[PDB]
Amino acid sequence: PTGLPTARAAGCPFDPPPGLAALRDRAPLTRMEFPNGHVGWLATGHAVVRAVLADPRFSHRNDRRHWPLADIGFPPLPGDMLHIDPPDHTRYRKLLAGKFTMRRMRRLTGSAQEIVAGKLDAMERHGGPLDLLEFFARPVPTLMVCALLGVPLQDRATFHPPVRYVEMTYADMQEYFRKLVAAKRAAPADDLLSDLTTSDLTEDELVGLCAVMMHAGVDSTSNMLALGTWALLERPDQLAALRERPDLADRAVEELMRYMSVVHTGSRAALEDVELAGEVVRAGESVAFSVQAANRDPARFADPDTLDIRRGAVGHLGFGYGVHQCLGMQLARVEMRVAFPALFARFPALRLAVPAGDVPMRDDLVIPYGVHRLPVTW
Ligand SMILES: COC(=O)[C@@H]1[C@H](O)[C@H](C)[C@H](O)[C@H](C)/C=C\C=C(/C)C(=O)Nc2c(C)c(OC(C)=O)c3c(c(OC)c(C)c(O)c3c2O)C(=O)/C(C)=C/[C@@](C)(O)[C@H](O)[C@@H](C)[C@H]1O
Ligand code: HEM
Numbered sequence: 001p002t003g004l005p006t007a008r009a010a011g012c013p014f015d016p017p018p019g020l021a022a023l024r025d026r027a028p029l030t031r032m033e034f035p036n037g038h039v040g041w042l043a044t045g046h047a048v049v050r051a052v053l054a055d056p057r058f059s060h061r062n063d064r065r066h067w068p069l070a071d072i073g074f075p076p077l078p079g080d081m082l083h084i085d086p087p088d089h090t091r092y093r094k095l096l097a098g099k100f101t102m103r104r105m106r107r108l109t110g111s112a113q114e115i116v117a118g119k120l121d122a123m124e125r126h127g128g129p130l131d132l133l134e135f136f137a138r139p140v141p142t143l144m145v146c147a148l149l150g151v152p153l154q155d156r157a158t159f160h161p162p163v164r165y166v167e168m169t170y171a172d173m174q175e176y177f178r179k180l181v182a183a184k185r186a187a188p189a190d191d192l193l194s195d196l197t198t199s200d201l202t203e204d205e206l207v208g209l210c211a212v213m214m215h216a217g218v219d220s221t222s223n224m225l226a227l228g229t230w231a232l233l234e235r236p237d238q239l240a241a242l243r244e245r246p247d248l249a250d251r252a253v254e255e256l257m258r259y260m261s262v263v264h265t266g267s268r269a270a271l272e273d274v275e276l277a278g279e280v281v282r283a284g285e286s287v288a289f290s291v292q293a294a295n296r297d298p299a300r301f302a303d304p305d306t307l308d309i310r311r312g313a314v315g316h317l318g319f320g321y322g323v324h325q326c327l328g329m330q331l332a333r334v335e336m337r338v339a340f341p342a343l344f345a346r347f348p349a350l351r352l353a354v355p356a357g358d359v360p361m362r363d364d365l366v367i368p369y370g371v372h373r374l375p376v377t378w
Contacts, residue, residue, distance in 0.1 A: 001031050004042060004068050004265070004288060006364040013361055014231060014259060015305060020044055020293035028299075029277035032288055035071035040267075040286040041276075042068070046297035046317070048277045049289045053322035055276075058268035058287065059085050060324060065269040068288035069365040077170075079208030082324055085271075089323060092209075095199055099192055102330040108147065112338045115143045120346045122163055128377030129353035133226055135163055136343070137374070141221035144335055145213050150184065150191025159214060173211035181206060213328070220262050221332050223362075223370025225339055228256040230359070230374055231307060232340065233350055238309050246341055248309055253336045255312025257319065258301070261292035262368035291317050292369075347378040 005019025023030050028045020043049045052058060059065060062074060062083050076083055081092035098104075119136050126135070142160040145151075151159070158168065158176075168176075181197060188194035196206055232239055232252075242248050267288040274281045281287055294317050296304040319326035326332070344350060352359070353375035360372040 001033070002042075003033055004290075006069070006265075008361075008364065011357065013356075013359070014227065014307075016261070016264070016290070016292040016296055017364075020290055021296070024290075024293050024297065027277075028297075029279065029287075032068070034066045034068055034267075034286060034288070036066055038066040038286060040066065040288065041281060043277075043287055043289040044293040044297075045277065046294040046300035049291065049294040049317060050321050051276060052268055052287050052289050053317070053320060053324070055274060055322075056086070057270060057272045057274045059271050060268055061085060064271070064284075065267045066286040068267045068286070069265055069367065077208055077212070078202075078204045079206065079210070079212045081209075081327075086323065091200075093323065093327075095196075095201070096327055099195065100327050100330055102333070105330040105334050108144070108331070109334055109338065111147050112140075112144060112334050113342065115140055115147070116339050116342045119163075120342060124346070126163075129375050130377070131373040132229060132376045133222060133371070133373045134161060136339075137222040137225040137229070138218065139163060140225065140339055141218045141332070141335055142214075144221075144331065145217040148191065148217075148331065149180075149193040149210060149213070150189050151180070155180075160218075170211055173214055174207050177207045177210040178203065180210075217328050217331070219370075220368045221335060223262050223368050224256065224260060224332070224336060226371050226374045227260045227262070227369075228253075228336070228340060229343055229350070229376075230352070230356075230371075231256065231259065232344065233352070234356075235307065238307070239344055239348075242309065242341055243344070249337050249341050250333075251312035252309035252340060253312070253333055254314060254316060254318075255307065255309045256336070256340075258295045258312065258316035259307050260369070261295045261316075261318050262370055263318070263320070264292040264369050265290055265367070291320070350376055350378045353377040 005017040007017055009018060024044035028048045029041060029043050032040055032042035034040055043052050060083050081089050119139050123135050138160055143156055146156045184194045185197045242252055267286045269286045270281045270283050273283045298304050319329040362370050
C-alpha cells in the first residue's frame, strides 16, 4: 500500500530516510508498490533482509525483479555475476572466490599502503583546500583494482581523472582489456588477470568482468572513504581512540560500513512461493530490501543510530549477504583498514573546506550513496 521512502533529513546526511524506521517498527516486512506499479514487498528488518539475501528461491536477474528506486532495461552484461542466478552465478563464484579471500588480499597490503602514501604525498605538496575524492578517495581504489588485475603502471593514468583525459566508456574499457588479456596470455605475471586467462571464461566474459570491477571496485569504496573520513573528522573522540590503539582500525571499518550503507537499497524476485517473516511471498513478487534500514535495526544493533568504532563488529549487511555477498569485500577491507588511519596520521587536523551543509550529496535514487566531492583542508 505504501511506496519506498528515499528522502533524507537535511542536516543528517549519514542517516537513512526517516520513513524507513516507521515502516520497520510497524513491520519488518511490508507491502510496497514499486515505481512501475508492481505491488510487491519491502523488507526493512535486519533478520528479514538477511533471509531475503540468503534464500535460494530469490532471483537477482533484471528480467525477474523490479527496480525499487526508479521506473525503467538492459541485457545481462558480460562479466556481470551479480544479476544472474545459480548455477550461472556459481560458475563465476567458484572461479573467483578463492582469489578474493582475506589471506590472498592482505598479501596486497604493502601495495595498498604505498598507494595511500603516494596520494597522501600529492595532497600535501598541492596544499589545501582540495577535493578528497579527486585526490584520494577515487585514486586509491582505482589503483588497487589496477594492481589486482596487473594493469601496467604506465597505463593506470587512463582510468581516473587527473589529480590537479575524457572518462572512458564501458566500450573503451573492453577494447583496452581485450588488448591486455592477449598480452597476459603470451606473458603471464603475478596478478589476478593472468591466472584467469587459463580459466573457462571466454574473452567476452573476462573482458566484461574487468570493466565491471573497474567501476564496482571503485565507486562504493571511494564513497566509503569520503563519507567515513567526513564522519571521523567530526568525532575527534573516535579519532583519539583510533590514534591510541590503532588495531581498532578493523572494528572502525566495519562500523563505518554499517553506519553508511552506501549500497542502501536493492530487490530480489521470488522464484517460488516463499514464507518470509510469517507471511508468504508470492512467486513472481519482488521483495525490495533496505540495507541501510537493516543496519540501523535496533533489533540487531543497540544504539544503532550512534556511530561508535569501539563496538564495530561483523553482522552488518553493508557488503550484502548470501551467494551474492561482495566478492571484493576483503580487498575493500584492506584498503580502508590502511587508508582511514593513514589519512589522519598524516593530516591530524583534516577538516572540511566548506560548511557541511554545502557538501554536494549524490541523488537519493543513485546507487551507491555518497558525495560528488568533499573539499578538505588541514
Ligand atoms: C548504470 O547504472 C547506474 O548508473 C547506477 C545508478 O544507480 C543509476 C542512477 C540507476 O540506479 C540505474 C541506471 C538503474 C537501474 C539499475 C539496475 C536495475 C541494476 O541492475 N543495478 C545495478 C547494476 C546495473 C550494477 O552494475 C552491474 C554491471 O551489475 C551494480 C553493480 C554493483 O557493484 C557490484 C552493485 C553493488 C550494484 O548494486 C549494482 C546495481 O544495483 C556493478 O557491478 C557496477 C559496475 C555498478 C556501478 C559502479 O556501475 C554503479 O553502482 C551503477 C549500477 C549505478 O551508478
Ligand atoms: C566499501 C566497499 C564496497 C561495498 C560497500 C560494496 C558493496 C557491495 C554489495 C552490497 C554487493 C551485493 C549487492 C547485492 O547483493 O544485491 C556487492 C557485490 C559485489 N561487489 Fe561489491 N562493494 C565494495 C567493494 C567492492 C570491490 C572493491 C570489488 C571488486 C574488487 C567489488 C566487486 C563486487 C562483485 C563482483 C560483486 C558481486 C558478487 C556476486 O554477485 O557474487 N566490490 N558489493
